[PDB]
Amino acid sequence: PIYVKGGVWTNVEDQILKAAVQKYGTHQWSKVASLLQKKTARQSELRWNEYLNPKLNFTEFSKEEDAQLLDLARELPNQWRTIADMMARPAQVCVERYNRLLELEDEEKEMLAEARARLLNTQGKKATRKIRERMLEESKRIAELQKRRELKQAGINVAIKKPKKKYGTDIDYNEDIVYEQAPMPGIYDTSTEDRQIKKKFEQFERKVNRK
Amino acid sequence: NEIVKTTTKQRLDAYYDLELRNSVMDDILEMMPESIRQKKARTILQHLSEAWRCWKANIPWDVPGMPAPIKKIIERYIKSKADAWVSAAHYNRERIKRGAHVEKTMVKKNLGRLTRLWIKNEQERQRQIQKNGP
Amino acid sequence: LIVNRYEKLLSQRPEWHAPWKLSRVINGHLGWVRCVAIDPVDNEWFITGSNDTTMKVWDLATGKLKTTLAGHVMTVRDVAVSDRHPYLFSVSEDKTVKCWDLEKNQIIRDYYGHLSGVRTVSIHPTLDLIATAGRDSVIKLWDMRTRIPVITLVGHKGPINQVQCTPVDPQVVSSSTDATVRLWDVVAGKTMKVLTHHKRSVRATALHPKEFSVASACTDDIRSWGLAEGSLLTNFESEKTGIINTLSINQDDVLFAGGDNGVLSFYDYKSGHKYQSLATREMVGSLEGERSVLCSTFDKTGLRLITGEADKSIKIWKQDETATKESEPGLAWNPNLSAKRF
Amino acid sequence: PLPTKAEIQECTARTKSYIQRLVNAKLANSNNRASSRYVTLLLNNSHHIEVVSKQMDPLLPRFVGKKARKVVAPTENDEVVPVLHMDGSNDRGEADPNEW
Amino acid sequence: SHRPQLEARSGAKAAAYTPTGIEHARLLPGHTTLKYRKFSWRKGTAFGRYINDMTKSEYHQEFLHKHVR
Amino acid sequence: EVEVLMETKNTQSPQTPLVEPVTERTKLQ
Amino acid sequence: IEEAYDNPHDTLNRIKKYLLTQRVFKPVDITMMENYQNISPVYSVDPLEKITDAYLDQYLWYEADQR
Amino acid sequence: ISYDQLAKLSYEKTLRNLATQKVQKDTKTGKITIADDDKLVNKLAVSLQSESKKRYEARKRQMQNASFINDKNKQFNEKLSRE
RNA sequence: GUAUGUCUAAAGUUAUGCUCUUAUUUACUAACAA
Incomplete structure (x- = not known):
């Protein structure tokens, strides 16, 4: 059922919100709200600001601090946000202290599963689609190989079709060297080495053929 | 295939900003004595970007682990950028008053900029009020 | 062999120059004054290119804003009045190299071609041909009359922060971020010789007037180079000073270097002797990183330095006419020797 | 000196x-006949020969070859x-990276 | 995904590229020739008798005051 | 700096109003 | 608003309680409506407090003009 | 430690790894045939492979040691935590 | 519904703890119906 948001902060929900904040940061409150099926953006942000943020404090005030507080009250009359700032505390808590001084789970688990799923899924659709295409492509390739290999076993040698070249100057790199930038001309002689490496190459090819 | 596009009203900002980050990056590399990698410049420029946003917010950009010289340099460059922005905004608003040809999108942009500018001004006044009494 | 050379150095004496003081300050622009260039025919007015894009022309004598010029879109990174013919070239990050005509105060000819936000223009002294180079890492050469690029001096492997056009065979000195400098067989389309004696961005170069040489800057070191052979001439004492933005040399062998620290350096061009440091001031409201001299040039006289600082200020500097070898000598020159270049 | x-x-x-020659080349190259008016023998051995440029039909492309190749x-x-940089900093060069 | 600029399109390739032989608009010959140089009632009241910061300029604050209400 | 021999100038407007050229056209009479 | 119509007395009671107690409120989002001369700030109070503000306002005007 | 020192110090090390256990020029061609011991070059090849292999396995162990979401983030938080 | 992107369009290049059965949710998707 669709409805108007609000309610009360269940601890699991709070935890989820915290996680979101770690993920997306303190200025994308829409996304975090979306992550919570019950609670609004504004609600969420407020909660983070007021209760949930770890760079707040809820430790009791020293006698000096009490003095500072009540003195502020005396001097700044009920401008409690300002007062809070002065204290260096969140405002509601300060107010409460001042006042003191003067005198179901299936649903929750659903959003959890969804939440964890989201947070562990950090890529735009382009990415997902791309990896999908990659694995599909791989599958296609192996299937093709299986055909080719099958035919070889059968006795019909089929050369693998090239990639249908996208443009006139598209390169196949096995045809010939990519952009043979040769080594710097030889000061020390290199002839024997050239031979040996050539032999090694040819030998490798032979091995592959036999393999 | 030597297309190279000119600047125009439509792509002016993007070009500006790329030029800026190139300049900043260069300066930081000049400064940096280890001769660090491009990947270590990514951290730098990303840092810069965050700084810019912080300035936009009027939240002071005080990252602890930096070297002071870098912090200085970035502060400078965002001041330059900021200057460019604010003046541009001012020019736009006079332009809008005049009733000139101006992009619907551009006018919205100017509204946004001027709002942020206003908020920054305002909360600076609040700070002032705090810092030296009523 | 080091001891010999050191001994020789100590034997010689770098001459005394009069020191400098902040004569005039102009809070003219509403941005950084990244370009400054002064009319070499008359020594009357000098223009300065802001980040605003409005390059503003300034009389020296009065100091007043002679007139604004605003044909560009993005920061006018460099300008260059041609003494040879009455054409103020300029250039922005908008990739334009617009040629103004001062006989009309409008722009005349644009030079399209540049792939990326061009950093510097230099006009050829003995031709109607101008050189320009930017992030493209390419120093192009424009025939003015016909407004085509004639030739493109490819070579540099990184943006090309300065350029200087000379009259000789090495017609171009291309100073890049690539930690190099190049001299070019312009006719060939080839670097005749490539000096590389820099650790960092070679991002401030200047031709000496009556010497036929060119000083260049790095992050600290400031070589000075003799461009006949394509040879080094002199290392300098810039060992602790900042990243050099600009490097305008005086007529009287008084090589200037502008610090990203903010500190105005001052060298005897012949020797290298740092004969004055001067920590600049910022405008009252500025931040402490902003005091950074981003531009500089001397007049025809050589008795007025002009500096485009990032405090949106166009500071000007006189040599002290009350100065002597006893009243303000230099900074007691000493070649350091600590595994040094001298 | x-x-x-x-x-x-x-x-x-x-x-x-x-540069004048280069600009001339650039100009007579271009299709705009308008810019034709701002334009400012051989031997292949001991053996001798006369080179000529045959004028072609001013419909067909002047330069059949050029086709904007990527190269x-x-x-x-x-x-x-x-x-080739001359320095060796150890004390300040190692103390700095901890700051940088 | 979509990424900042680092190593610019260097006009090395554009140099080695073949000419196009198109006629652009502005390369049409403009300004062919060059120039050259020569060479009682008032008692009863309660009260009877530059900065280089674009965000703190007098012009700026004033402007904001003007253009907000 | 209101005290020092450094002479500051917060200029704004042009003197020559974009008509008077920066260099003048030399010619016969 | 709807609920308030439904439960007037209760709503009133709630309002009274809030007035007696509540001195820290939900933060006020803002925007700028664009009159192309002068952009005008638009404060957007969080609905619950807004009702309180309304009622208080109306009461004040009725009392002020009455007095 | 600079790359100056770390080079010489690594140089010193591989000299301890050594401490464990003719020129003919055709000047017309410019070809400087230094005929040297083919057994020693093979001993370089095997040693150098072994050095690189030792290092390669060293990372593999350190990768298999263990507030994140994916492989990279875990390491990215480790890049933050080391400071 | 589209941009867009792949695919096909035929001729043989000469080598020797689990399985199970179901019913329910929720989510997403759907030019398929309402």
């Missing part, structure tokens, strides 16, 4: 001649060149 005036005249003459440049840095 600041370069000789006479030799400056030489260089100017050479380079000016070159990668080979660098041709056959001669090696040093990159």
